[PDB]
Amino acid sequence: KRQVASGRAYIHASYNNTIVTITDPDGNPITWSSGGVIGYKGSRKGTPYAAQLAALDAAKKAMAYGMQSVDVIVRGTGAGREQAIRALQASGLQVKSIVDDTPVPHNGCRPKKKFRKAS
Amino acid sequence: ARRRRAEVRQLQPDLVYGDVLVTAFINKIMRDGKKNLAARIFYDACKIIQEKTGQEPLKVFKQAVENVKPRMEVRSRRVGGANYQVPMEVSPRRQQSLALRWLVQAANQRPERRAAVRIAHELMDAAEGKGGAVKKKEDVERMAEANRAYAHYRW
């Protein structure tokens, strides 16, 4: 109940789950979703299917505040990074843009050993 | 089928309807290589189709067959973990055979004292979308896809 028409959708990709925040054009959340929210327990969530309904859920929830179109920001390299984007296109929302924006350090903190590989 | 691809055998067409989708059904009704039994069952079943409905049996037959073949099924697969039921398409030649088979099996589940009657009533009920056989079709398709989550193995 706000009538924002336009806003932003942040897709957050990850190997373990995919989550999607929808947001007014200043970055304040309107609604969100993820694979858990959709229904999935541990481990499916990361699946591309999860991300499909995750994104669709979020958009359906945002059509309620009468959104017509959004900008897409995607961060993460997970599975179903794209399926979240496809789903927002076929969502009926108008995707005005897509922008990768996964954060990376200019060599900052020591990774956890699972992300260290070698030298 | 490591080597070549294997062609579908082209079965000699019918003697009464001239259709190959029938001798197909007639072979599946057959057991222990008694083909005369099978024909006598099926053509009889056609005569009972004609009684309990004015419709030509051949359009009744084909109707139920189309009504039975699945658009999706599952096929177990693994990389690790456990056998993941993977949803996937049902390539036309298989829809053909899965339908014919289920039809006959379903037919022989029935309580009807003799065959033909069993076949007729199963051939009929399936045209009307009801009658177990369509159980398999639907409970296959429904059980497949319900694993959409694992459909990312298209092939």
Place this chain on the structure above:
Amino acid sequence: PSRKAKVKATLGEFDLRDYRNVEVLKRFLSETGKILPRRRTGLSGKEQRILAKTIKRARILGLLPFTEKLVRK
């Protein structure tokens, strides 16, 4: 082949230490902010060494970005 458009050809007689010149300098940066590789700058080993030391300087002045954001992904 791998012989598309280079950079060194695109421009002319430019100073390689002019960290204040931007419209020139910004031609050597990624679609994002990343400094372009020699295969795409077409600079000599030594030319490219000096490009960094300035593109970096130019970054500290706030004339050149350190990083950006990939459009249309």
Place this chain on the structure above:
RNA sequence: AAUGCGCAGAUACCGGGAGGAACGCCGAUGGCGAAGGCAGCCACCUGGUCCACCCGUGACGCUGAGGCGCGAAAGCGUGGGGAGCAAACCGGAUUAGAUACCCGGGUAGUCCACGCCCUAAACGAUGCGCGCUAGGUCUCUGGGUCUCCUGGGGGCCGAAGCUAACGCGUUAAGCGCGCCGCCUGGGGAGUACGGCCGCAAGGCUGAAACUCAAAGGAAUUGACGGGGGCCCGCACAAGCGGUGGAGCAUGU
């Protein structure tokens, strides 16, 4: 998967702040250093080096037992600091067990200053210097008449030659000379003892009794791999009928 976090509102998202640490791209086929090692940017301080001129000194050279200094990481002392990471440790899993690999936490430590420690697969497993002995090609950095010539450095291929072989081959493991260091079968053992050094942990030096007929290097042919690639088989898959239950026959 669970432990764990979350209605005291987390995760995702926006803005502001504090901090500790490390510097993405450029970036390697690169560069510098005697080695260990050295990468954001600026300034100051400062070491080595290469080239051109052929100006000066006039054999002033090489090597180098001792000595003295330097020396990744871990470790130690005194303060400081502490984001992330993480021995020990505390939990969740897995398992036959799992004092492990996987998961959630986490102290020393990792960072700074000062002082110790002196080790290593401290490796090119190749001491330093000089002279000589086909070439080709790629690259870093000078100079010149700048299709190329001429230096210094880093690679690859190869003449002669060497090597047990693998390999090396103007960046020798070739041909030679000078000097230092080191080896003398395996285990006992880098141990004991003595000395010296260190706050410690330990380091340097370093045996013997006893004991074995081997221990080794390179290559060859196989077989093998829970290595690769290619490919078959009713091998699986797709099917249709069985055995495993029953009674009996026959074999054990």
